[PDB]
Amino acid sequence: TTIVALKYPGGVVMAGDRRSTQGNMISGRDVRKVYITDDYTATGIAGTAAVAVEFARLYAVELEHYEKLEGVPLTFAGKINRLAIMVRGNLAAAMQGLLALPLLAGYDIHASDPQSAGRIVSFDAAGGWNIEEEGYQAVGSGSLFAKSSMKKLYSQVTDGDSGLRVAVEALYDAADDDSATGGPDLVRGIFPTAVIIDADGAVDVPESRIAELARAIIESRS
Amino acid sequence: TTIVALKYPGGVVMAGDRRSTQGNMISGRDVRKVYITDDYTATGIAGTAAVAVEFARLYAVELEHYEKLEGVPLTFAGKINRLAIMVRGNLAAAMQGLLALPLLAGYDIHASDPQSAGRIVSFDAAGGWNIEEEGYQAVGSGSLFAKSSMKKLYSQVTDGDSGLRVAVEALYDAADDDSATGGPDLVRGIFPTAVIIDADGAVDVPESRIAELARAIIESRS
Amino acid sequence: TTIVALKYPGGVVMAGDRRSTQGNMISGRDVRKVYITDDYTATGIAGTAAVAVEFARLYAVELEHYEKLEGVPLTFAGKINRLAIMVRGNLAAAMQGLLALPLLAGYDIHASDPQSAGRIVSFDAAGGWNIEEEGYQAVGSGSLFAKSSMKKLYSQVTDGDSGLRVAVEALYDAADDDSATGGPDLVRGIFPTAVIIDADGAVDVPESRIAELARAIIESRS
Amino acid sequence: TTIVALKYPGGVVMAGDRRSTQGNMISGRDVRKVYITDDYTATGIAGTAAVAVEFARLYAVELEHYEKLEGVPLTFAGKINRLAIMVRGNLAAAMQGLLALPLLAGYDIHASDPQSAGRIVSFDAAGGWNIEEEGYQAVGSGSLFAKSSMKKLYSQVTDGDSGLRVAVEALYDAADDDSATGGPDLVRGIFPTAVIIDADGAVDVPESRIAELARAIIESRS
Amino acid sequence: TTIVALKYPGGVVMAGDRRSTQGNMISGRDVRKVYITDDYTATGIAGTAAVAVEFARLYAVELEHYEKLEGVPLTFAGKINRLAIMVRGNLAAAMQGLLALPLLAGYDIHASDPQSAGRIVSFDAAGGWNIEEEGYQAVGSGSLFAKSSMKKLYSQVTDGDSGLRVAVEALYDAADDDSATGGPDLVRGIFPTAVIIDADGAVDVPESRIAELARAIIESRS
Amino acid sequence: TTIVALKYPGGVVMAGDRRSTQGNMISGRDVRKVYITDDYTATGIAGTAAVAVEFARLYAVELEHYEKLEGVPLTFAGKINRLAIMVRGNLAAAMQGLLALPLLAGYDIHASDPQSAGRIVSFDAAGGWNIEEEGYQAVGSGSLFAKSSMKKLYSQVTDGDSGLRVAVEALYDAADDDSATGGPDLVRGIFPTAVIIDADGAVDVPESRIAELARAIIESRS
Amino acid sequence: TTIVALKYPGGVVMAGDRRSTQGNMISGRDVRKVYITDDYTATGIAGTAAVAVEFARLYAVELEHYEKLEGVPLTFAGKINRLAIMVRGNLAAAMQGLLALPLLAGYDIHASDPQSAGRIVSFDAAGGWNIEEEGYQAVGSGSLFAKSSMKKLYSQVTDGDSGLRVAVEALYDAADDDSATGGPDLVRGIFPTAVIIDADGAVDVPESRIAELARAIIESRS
Amino acid sequence: TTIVALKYPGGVVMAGDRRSTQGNMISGRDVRKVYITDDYTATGIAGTAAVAVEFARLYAVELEHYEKLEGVPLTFAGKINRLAIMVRGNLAAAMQGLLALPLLAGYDIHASDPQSAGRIVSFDAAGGWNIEEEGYQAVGSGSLFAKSSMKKLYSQVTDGDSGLRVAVEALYDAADDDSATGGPDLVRGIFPTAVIIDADGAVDVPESRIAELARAIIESRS
Ligand SMILES: CC(C)C[C@H](NC(=O)CNC(=O)c1cc(Cl)ccc1Cl)B(O)O
Ligand SMILES: CC(C)C[C@H](NC(=O)CNC(=O)c1cc(Cl)ccc1Cl)B(O)O
Ligand SMILES: CC(C)C[C@H](NC(=O)CNC(=O)c1cc(Cl)ccc1Cl)B(O)O
Ligand SMILES: CC(C)C[C@H](NC(=O)CNC(=O)c1cc(Cl)ccc1Cl)B(O)O
Ligand SMILES: CC(C)C[C@H](NC(=O)CNC(=O)c1cc(Cl)ccc1Cl)B(O)O
Ligand SMILES: CC(C)C[C@H](NC(=O)CNC(=O)c1cc(Cl)ccc1Cl)B(O)O
Ligand SMILES: CC(C)C[C@H](NC(=O)CNC(=O)c1cc(Cl)ccc1Cl)B(O)O
Ligand SMILES: CC(C)C[C@H](NC(=O)CNC(=O)c1cc(Cl)ccc1Cl)B(O)O
C-alpha cells in the first residue's frame, strides 16, 4: 500500500494504488483507497482495510453532522484536531494488530493568497500531526521509495498535469521496489486512482488520463 | 518461488522463475533456480538461497566423485538415496530457519521402454521421497496454483513443445496468484528458465522460445 | 467445508457440501450449510457449526424484524452493513476457537439493468467486506482448489444450467483435493445442496438434477 | 492409515490401505505400506513415512546379513527381539514427532502342528511386544473400527478366501469411519494391498481378486 | 459411562449402565443415569455426576414451569432449543473440569405418520445439536464400541423387544472394551436401566426382562 | 496390577493377575506377571510391561552367569543386593515415566530350621529393600485392599492349600476394589497365575486348582 | 554507515563515510571503512567495528598466504568462495549482536573484454552471495536512500569522474536521510574516502578531488 | 532534543532546537519546541511530540480559564503546582513509552527587586519540581553537554545579547556531541528558536539575530 500527495501552484493532488494482500497471497485487485471527505478535503488511510473504511465513513459523518448542526463548516485546524482525536482513540487497538494511518490533503479558502492554499497533513500512531512544508508526502509500506523518487522529480512540477505525472511516476517506482504495492495492469486494465483539489473543489481524475500517463511512463522506461 | 516439472512422451521438462525476495522487499530479479546435475538429471531447490546453492554444488561434486572413483555412473535409486540422505541431514538446520526442499527430474537409460523413461521425484522435510505417477509436480510457495492449473492443462501435452507451453502457463498462473513468484518482465526482458531432458541428454532451452511462448500466452489472456 | 457462489446472466447460484468432521473423525454426513435468508438473498457460513446456525437464525430474525417494523425491506447496502456488524462483534470469540466466516449472494431489484443484478459479497475475520467483480467466489478450507477450478471453467457459463454444472464440478474438485470436504455418495445417495436466485426469487434446487449432474461428471472423469 | 492382520487355518493374511495425508490435505494416493521381509514374515508400519521405510529396509538387511553370516536363519523369537530392539532405540525420536509403530505376521516352520503355525505380533511405543491369541489385530489411526468389525465378522473365516474377504471388509469399515484412511477408488482403480503367508511362503495377492471382492462388498452395502 | 438410544417402528428405547468411578477406583455400583423428563421425552447425561443431576432437575423444572404457565406443552424444537441453551451456558465450566454431555430421545405426537415419530438428538460441548437419521446413537467414553456394535446389529431390530436386546448387547460390548463402563453383575444382581417411549408415553423397563436378556447374551457368548 | 506373596509352614506362595490396560482401555487379557528366576526364587514386577520383562530376563541371565562362572550359586543376600542394584540403576528412567517395582519370594536352603526358610523381600523406587516379618506382602495399584484382606484372612493359613486359597481371595478383593486389576473370567476361562516354592523347589500351580478355588469363592460370595 | 560501489566503462569505484556512533552518541569522526585487499580487489564491511577490522585483516592475510604458497593468485570465484565461507562461519556470532556485512568490488584480468571487467558482489547474513548486473550497489543502514538516488543518477556516468561524482552525491543523500551516516564536515575538513580500480590496479583517491566535488554539490543544493 | 534556559540581569532567555527523529531516521526539520504560555511565562517540553503539544495547549487553556474566572492571574507558586500536578498525572503513561518532561522560565512581577525576578523551574518524572539557583538549566537527551558548556561560558553573561550568544553556543555544543539534536542548517536556512522574557513581557527573538550569532560562532570554531 502506498498513497502519495503533493502540491502544485493552484492546489493539491493525491494518488493511490489498488492492491490488497493477505500475507504473500493476493486478495484484491481493484481496491479504492482514496476518499473525498467534503468539498475541499481528501483523506487516504493505510493499514487494516476494515478500520480504514470505518474511519473514513465516521470522519465524513462527523464533518457533515457539524456542518448541519452549526450552519457553518469547520476550519482546517478543527478538522485536523478531530482527525487527531480519532487516531489517538485507536492506540489500544493499534497495538495487537488493528492499525490505521491517515494522510490528509486540503485547500484552504480562508487563506489570503490563493496560490499558497494547498495543505498536506501527516499523522503518527500516537495521534501527533505534522503540516508538511516541502511540498510532498507519502504513506504506506512503500513510502520511502516514493519519497526518494519525488525528491528528485519535484523540480518538474509546474501545474496539475505535471504533478499528476510525477505522482504516477512515484507510484510506479514504489510498486517497482515493493511487492505489496500494485503496479499498472495492462492485461486487465486497472490503474491507480487520483483526486485533484483546487479553488473549484475536489474532483476525481478520469481513468483515461491516468492510463495515458502510465503508458507513456512504461514506454519511457522500456 | 515455484518450480514445475512434467513428463511428455520422450522425456521430461523442468521450469522455474527468477524472483528473490526478503520479506516484502524485492531483492533479486534474475536468479537461476534450475541446475543440470549430470547428463541425464536436473534438480530444483526451493527455500533459503545459500542452502540451495550449497546443496546443488555438493550433490554435483558427489555424483562426479563416485563416477570417477568407480568408473561407472550410479543408478537412479542410488542418486535418490544420496539426495534423501543429504536432505535428512539438514533436519536440525531445517528447523529454526534454514530450509531447502528439492525436486528431481531424470531420464532412465536402463529402462526397457524408451518412451516411459522419464522420472520425477519429490521430497519432504524429513527426508522421505516419492516417485510421481500422475505426470507432473510442483514445489515452492505457489505450487498449489501451478498444480491446479496443470490438472486442467495436462490433456494437451503431446510432445516437448506442448509440455513447455503448459509449464510456462502454469508458472504464469502461479505468479498471478502468488506475490512471491516473479512473472514475465517485458520492460526488462527477463523470462523463466527451462531444461529439457530426453534420450540425447539434458539441454537448456534458449530464451527466445520462452519469450515467444510468454508473449503468446499474454496475448491470449488479454 | 467448501461453499461456492457464482453469477450467470439472470442471477446467481450458490452450492455447498454436506460433511462435518471432528478432527480426523467423520461426525456428520448430511449437514445443510446453505440458507435462504429472504426472498432474494442467500447466505453460507463456514467454521464452527453452532456459531453458524446461531448467526443464520439471528440474521434472518433481524431482517424480518426490520421489514415488519418499517413496512419496507432493507436495501442491499444495509444488509451488508448488518452482516458486517454481526461478524465484527464476534472477533473476541473468533479468537480462542469460535470462528464463523460468511458468504452472501443476492439479487438487486433496484438495479437499472436486470441482467447485471446478481451480487456476491465476501467477508473477513475482522468484519471487512468486499463485493466481487470477477463472477465467482469460494469460502472454506477447500476454497483455493475450487477457485482455481472455476478460473478455468468459467468460460462455459451461459445460463443457470451451465453455472450449476460448473459449481458441482468445482465442489467435486475441492472434495478431490481436500479430505475435510465431502464428495458425492452413491452408496447412500447424498449430494451437495444448491440455491438459485433470479428475478422471481430464491429457489432450492431439487436433488434429482444435482444427482444427474454428479453422475455425468463422474462418468466423464472415469 | 490402517493395517490389519488375521489368522486362518493354514496361515496368515495381512492387508493395508494406500492413502497418505499431510494434515487435512491429501498427498499420496497409491502408497504401499506392506512389505515382505523374508520367505515367511511380513511387516506393516504406521506413522511417519520416512521412518517406516527406513525401519523396513534396515530390518530386511539385518535379517539377510545374519542369514548369510551364520548359514542358518533366525528363529521367530530372535526376529521379535531384533524388531523390539529397533523400536526401543527410536523412543527419543518417537517423542517430538518421529513415530513408527510396526505389526508383524509370520509362519513358524518349526511348530509341531502345521495348522497352528501362524503368528501375529504387536508392539508398543516403548518397545514392548505381545503375541496375539484371539486371531486378529489392527494398527493405525482407524484400528478401533477395524477391530470392532473383525470382532463380529471373525466367525465366517474358514480358509484364505474368507479371511481375505473379512480383511477387505474391515478396511472398508475403517475407511468409512476414518477420514485419514483411503477407501476403494473406482474412478482411478486403486485398491488395498494384501499378502498371504502359508506353508509355501509369502505371496502378494493379485489386484484382480481384491477388486472383485471390493466390488462385491460395495454392491452388498448399496 | 455409556448411554445408548435407538429407534424401532413405534417408538424409541434408551439404555444406560450403572458404574461410577473416581480415577481408577470404583466409587459407585448402582448409579442411575437415565431420567424421564416428561410424558414423551427422556434424557441421558454423561460426565460429572453433580452437573448431570443439576442439569436434569433444572430441565424438568423448566419444562413443567412452562407447561403450567402457558397451559400447553412446548413443541420438540422448543425443548431442543432450551436444552441447547442450557448446554451452551456451561461452556466456561465445561472447560477446567466440569463437563456434561446430554442425549435426548422423544416421541412426537404432532407428526403426521405415527410410525416415524421417534426422534434422537445429540449435542456437543459448544451447544450445537444434531438430529439423528441413521436410527441409533451413543454417548460416553465407550460410545465408539457401542456404535460399532449397533452398526452390525441394527438389521435385526423389528419391534421393542428386538431393540431392547440390541441395546443390551451394545452395552455389553462397550463394557467389554472399556474399563470405565460397568457390565452385568451376577454376584450382586445389578443390571443396566432402560426406558421405552411409544405412543402411550414413556415407561421404565422392569429389571426381570433385562436380567433375562443379559443372561441369554452371556450364555450365547460363552 | 496386583501381585501377592505369603508364607506358610514349609514354604511360600506367590500369585498375580492377568489384566493389562492403557489408560482406561483394556489392552491385554492373559498377561503373565510371575516368573521363576531359579530353582528356589520367584519374582513379580509391576509397572511398565517392557521394563518388567527386560528386568526379569536380565536378572535370570545374571544369576545363571554367576552360577556357571563360579560353580556355586549365590546366597540370598547376594541376590537381594543384585536386585537392589538393578532397581537403583533405573531411578532416572523411573522418573519421567518408566517405572518398575519388584517383589521377591524365596526358600533358603542354608537355614538351620527348614520350617522357617521362606523369605519375602520388598523394594522401593530408590533401591531400598526390606525383609518382611509379618508373613505377607502385596505390590501394585491394588496392594492396599489385598493387604487389608490378608490382615483378616491370615489366621486360617495352615498349609499350602490354605495359603493358595487366601491368596486367591485377596486377589479377588483387590479386583473388586480396583478397576485396573483383572478378576476371574468365566466366559473366557482365564484365572490368576500362582507359583509355590518349598524344599523341593519352585513349581507352577495348574490352572484347574485355581479355577476350582475361584468358583468356590464366587459361590460363597453369592 | 553507508558504503556504495558502482561500475563505469573501464573499472569500478567504491566510496564510504567516516561516522562511528554508539547508540545516539557520536564516538568517531574519521573512521576509515574501505580497504584495499590486493592489487585488483577492494572490500567494505558494515556493522560492528572490531569484527569488520578482524575480517579485513584475516581476508588479506589469507589471500597473501595462498598467493605465496601456490605462486599464482586466486581467481575471482575462489575469492568469492573464501569470503562467503568467512561470512558463513560468523552466523552464531552474527546472532546475539556481533554482525558484519561485506561488499566486494574488483577487476577481472582474465575477462575477454577489458571494458566489461568490473565486478560487484554483495553478501547476506547466512553466507549467500550475489553478483550485481545493474551497475551499482550499497550496503549499510542508509543503503536504501543511496540506491534510490543512484537509480536516478546512473544515466550520467560516462567515465571515472562521473562515477565518483555520482557516488559522492549518493553518500550525501544517504547522510541527509540517515542520522547514523556522517556528512561532509567543512568546519573540520573531513570527507568520505574512495578507491578506484581499473586495468592498472586499485588506487586511493586524493582528498582534494573529493573536497572539490563535495563543495560543488553543496553549492548546487544551496 | 535539547532545550536550554538561563538568567541575565533583567530577565530570562530560553532556546531550543528543531530536529525530530524516529529512531535513527530523521522525520522533522523545523519543529518548534518552545511556547509562550502567558505574558510572563515560557515552557519547553521534551519527549513524545503529541504528549508535549497536548500538555502545552492544556496548560495554556487552564491558565487562561483561571484568569478569566477569578479576574486575577495566578501567582508563580500556583502555576508551578498546576504544572507539577499535570506532570504527576501522566506517571502511568510515562511508563510504557509516553513520557514528557517540561522546563519552565518566568518573570515574577511581585518581587521586591526587579533585577532578581527571573525564575527557572525543572521537573522530574514523578512530579517533583526544583527552583534553580545557579543561573542555567538544560533538558533533553543532550542536556549534559549543554550544561557542561554553560558551566564554563556563564562568566561572560552581562545582558540579553550575551545570554543569547551563550545559549546558542550551548545548543551548538549539544548538537556537536549528540546525534538526536539538530544543528544549524546553512543549506536550508533553519536555526534554533529563542524567547526572551523581561519586565515588558515575553517576546520571540527574530531569526536574523540568531542566524548572525550562529554564523559568527561557526566562523570562530573554523
Ligand atoms: C486499504 C488496505 C487494502 C490497505 C492495505 N492493507 C491490506 O491489504 C491488509 N490486508 C487486510 O487487511 C486483509 C484483507 C483481506 Cl481481503 C483479508 C485479510 C486481511 Cl488481514 B495496504 O497494503 O497497507
Ligand atoms: C532460490 C531462492 C531465491 C528461493 C526463494 N527464496 C528466497 O528468495 C528467500 N530469500 C532469501 O533467502 C534471502 C535473499 C536475500 Cl538477497 C537476502 C536475504 C534473504 Cl533471507 B523462494 O521464493 O522460495
Ligand atoms: C457447518 C459446519 C459443519 C462447517 C464445517 N465445520 C465443522 O465440521 C467443524 N466441526 C464442529 O464444529 C464439530 C462438530 C461436531 Cl458434530 C462435534 C464437534 C465439533 Cl468441534 B467445515 O468443514 O468448515
Ligand atoms: C506409511 C505412511 C503413509 C503412514 C501414514 N502417515 C502419513 O501419511 C503421515 N504423513 C507424512 O509422514 C507426510 C507425508 C508427506 Cl507426502 C508429506 C509430509 C508428511 Cl509429514 B498413516 O496414515 O499413518
Ligand atoms: C453419571 C456419572 C456417574 C457419569 C460417569 N462419571 C463419573 O463417574 C465421574 N466421576 C465423578 O464425577 C466422581 C464421583 C465420585 Cl463418587 C467422586 C468423585 C468424582 Cl470426580 B461416567 O463414566 O461418564
Ligand atoms: C506387567 C504389566 C502389565 C503391569 C501393569 N501395567 C500396565 O498394564 C501398564 N501398561 C503398559 O505399560 C502399556 C501396555 C500396552 Cl499393551 C500399551 C501401552 C502401555 Cl503404556 B499393571 O497394572 O501395573
Ligand atoms: C566500521 C563501523 C564504524 C561501522 C558502523 N558501526 C558502528 O559505528 C557501530 N559501533 C560500534 O561498534 C561501537 C563503536 C564504539 Cl567507538 C564503541 C562502541 C561500539 Cl558498540 B556503521 O554505522 O554501521
Ligand atoms: C518535541 C519533540 C520533537 C521532542 C523530540 N522527540 C522526538 O522526536 C520523538 N519522536 C516522536 O515522538 C515521533 C515523531 C514522529 Cl514524526 C514519528 C514517530 C515518533 Cl515516535 B526530542 O528529541 O526529545
Residue numbers in the entry:
A (entry chain Q), B (entry chain b), C (entry chain R), D (entry chain a), E (entry chain S), F (entry chain Z), ...: 1 to 222
Reproduce text from the manuscript describing this model.
The Mycobacterium tuberculosis (Mtb) proteasome system selectively degrades damaged or misfolded proteins and is crucial for the pathogen’s survival within the host. Stacked β-rings enclose the degradation chamber where active sites containing the catalytic triad of βT1, βD17, and βK33 proteolyze substrates.
We found that ixazomib inhibited the peptidase activity of 20SWT against Z-VLR-AMC. For the ixazomib-bound 20SWT variant, we observed distinct density features that fit the inhibitor in the active sites. Consistent with the described inhibition mechanism for this class of proteasome inhibitors, the boronic acid group of ixazomib is located within 1.5 Å of the catalytic oxygen atom of βT1 to allow the formation of a covalent bond. Twelve β-subunit peptides displayed decreased deuterium uptake. The binding of ixazomib to 20SWT stabilizes an on-pathway conformation that closely mirrors 20Sresting.
